[PDB]
C-alpha cells in the first residue's frame with residue numbers, strides 16, 4: 145500500500161467501511177432542522193459578502209470554543225479542506241526553510257504533504273508532549289526550527305493538558321520554534337482552555353488548523369479555519385491566494401449553523417454522547433477476543449486496536465477482514481518513520497451511517513470469531 | 517499588487533465587484549427547482565457511495581458535452597476546485613522533471629502554482645495554437661517536455677478548432693510532449709467536438725481539467741474533473757490522494773442536476789442567452805475604451821484602454837473611487853507584464869441587479885474620469 149488514503153479509497157467499495165474517519169453518521173434529532181431548512185442557509189450565503197461570512201463562521205466557532213483571542217484576530221484563511229491548509233503550511237515551511245519535526249504517530253498524509261513540498265522532516269515522539277525532559281532535548285537540539293503537532297493526536301487520542309501546552313509553547317519561544325497545530329479533533333478533546341491566548345501572548349509564530357470533517361456530518365462539504373500569527377500572516381495569505389480566492393459562502397452558512405447548534409444543546413448532546421455509545425459497542429463486541437482496545441487520553445471517533453494476540457499483523461488481518469466485507473485501516477502507516485516496528489495495530493472509525501455501523505460491528509465480531 | 521487574486525480579494529469589499537470571474541449571477545427559471553429541492557440532492561448524495569457518485573457526475577458531464585470517450589474512461593479524479601487540480605498537475609510536472617511551456621496570456625495563478633511547485637517554466641505565445649509553423653517551431657525545439665494550455669483561453673477567448681486541436685495533439689505526439697489542457701471555460705465555447713477522443717486516439721500522456729465555478733453559480737460550491745491517460749494515472753492518482761480522499765457527494769449530486777438541466781434545455785437558453793445580454797449591455801455602455809473582439813465570447817470582457825493614456829492599475833484605482841472594482845490586465849502576461857499594461861478585464865457573471873446597475877455606474881464613472 146502507498147498510503148492510508150489508498151486503503152481508504154479501497155474501503156469505499158466495501159459493505160462495512162470502517163477505514164476513513166470522515167464524519168458520515170446520520171443527522172441526529174438536533175441537526176434535522178438544518179437540513180429541513182437548507183434554503184435559509186443558501187439564502188444567507190447569498191445575502192452576505194464573502195469577507196463577512198468568513199468572520200461570521202470564525203467568531204461562531206470562537207464562541208463554541210470560548211476563545212476571545214480567536215474572536216478578535218483577523219489573521220486567518222478559510223480552505224475547503226483541512227488537508228488544503230496543511231499543504232499551504234507545508235509550502236510555507238519549505239519557503240521559509242524551516243526544519244520541521246513532525247509528530248509520530250500521525251495521519252500519514254501530513255508527512256506525505258510535508259515531503260512532497262520539500263520540507264526537512266524530523267520524527268518527533270508524541271509522548272514528549274507529556275514528558276518535560278524529552279521535549280526539552282528535542283527543542284534544545286538545534287536540529288529543528290518548527291514543530292508540527294496534532295492535538296488531540298490521531299489515532300492515539302493523546303491530548304495535551306493546559307500545563308503541558310503552556311510548557312510546550314514556552315520552550316518553543318525560548319528557541320524561536322514555530323508551532324503548527326492540527327486541531328482537527330478539538331471538539332472530541334476533554335480539555336477546555338484557550339490555546340489561542342497562550343499562543344498569541346507568547347508572541348511566537350504559529351499556525352492552527354481547524355476542521356469540520358471529523359465532527360459534523362456534511363457529506364465532505366467542509367470548512368477548515370487556518371489561523372496564524374501576525375508576523376507570518378501576509379506570506380501565509382500569499383500562499384493561500386495562489387490556490388484559493390475563497391471558500392463557498394453556502395458551506396460557511398451551513399457549518400455555521402452546525403457549530404451554533406452544537407453550542408446551544410452542548411457537545412455531549414450533539415457529539416460526544418453518540419461517540420461514547422459507539423465506543424461501548426466495539427468494546428462490548430471485542431471483549432474476550434485477544435484484541436486489546438487502546439485506552440489510558442480522550443475519546444476520538446476512532447478505535448485503536450491491538451491485535452497482537454490474534455497472531456496476524458495489521459495488513460494481513462485487514463486482508464482477512466476484507467474477505468468478510470469489512471474494511472479497516474492497518475496501523476503501521478501512522479508511525480510513518482518506523483512502520484515495520486508498529487504492525488500490531490488496526491484502526492476502526494466510528495462516525496459511519498448508523499444502520500451500517502451497528503450491523504457492521506456485529507459482523508466484525510462474527511468475523512473476528514471465525515478467525516480463531 | 518502581486519497577483520490577480522490579490523486584486524480579486526480586494527474587490528469583494530466594493531459595491532460593484534467586476535474583478536473575479538466566478539459565476540455569481542442569480543438562479544434563472546431553469547435552475548430554481550434545484551434550490552427549491554436542495555433536500556433532494558442532499559438525500560441523493562447520502563444514498564449513494566462515493567465511487568458511484570463520482571462516476572455518475574462524470575457520465576452526466578460526458579452526456580452534456582456528448583463525449584463517449586470521457587463516458588468510458590475511469591482514470592479521473594474529483595477535486596473541490598479546478599486550481600486544486602492545476603496544483604496536482606504542477607506537482608506531477610515537477611516529479612517527472614518535465615520542462616513545461618505555459619500559454620501566455622493566462623490567469624496568473626496557473627503560472628504561480630507551477631512556479632511554487634518548482635517546475636521549469638517557459639512561455640509560449642497564445643496564437644501559436646493557430647499558426648502551424650509557429651507551433652511546430654515550439655514543439656520541435658527540444659526545450660520542452662510538456663505543454664500547458666487553457667482552451668478557451670482566459671481572457672482573450674481564443675478557442676482552438678478541431679483542425680488545430682488534432683494538429684496540436686499529433687505535433688506533441690511526435691516529440692514526447694504531455695498536453696495539459698484547461699477546459700474551465702468549455703461550455704462557453706462555440707465549437708463542439710470530442711477533445712477526449714482525439715487525445716485518447718493519439719496515445720500521448722495528457723491531463724484535462726474541467727470546472728463548474730465559471731459556469732454554474734453555486735456560491736463557489738464546485739466540482740472539477742481531472743481526467744488523465746492510463747500511462748500516468750497511478751502517479752496522478754497518488755498525488756491526488758496525498759491531498760484528497762474524495763470530494764463532496766452532496767456537491768456532486770447538486771451540480772450533476774445543474775449539468776443535467778443544461779443538457780435538456782440547451783446551453784443557450786440556460787447559460788449563453790444571458791451572457792449575450794450582458795456582453796451587449798456593456799458593449800453599448802462603452803460605445804473611448806475599445807472592447808477586445810475578433811474567438812468565443814467568455815463571461816468576461818477584455819477592454820483596451822490605451823486611448824485613455826492610462827495604465828491598467830492607475831485606471832483601476834481611479835475606478836475604485838466610485839465603488840467599482842475591475843482587474844488590471846498586466847498580470848495575465850505573467851512572463852511580460854511590463855509590455856502589457858494597456859488592458860482591463862470586467863466580469864459579467866455577477867448578481868443581476870448588481871451587474872446592470874453597476875454597468876451604468878461604470879459608464880458614468882468612465883465619462884466623469886475622462887472629463
Ligand SMILES: N=C(N)N/C=C/CC(=N)C(=O)O
Pocket residue numbers: 149152163164165166227251253298446493757758759760761762
Ligand atoms: N485527506 C486524505 N487524502 N485522507 C484523510 C484521511 C482522514 C482520516 N481518515 C482520519 O483522520 O482518521
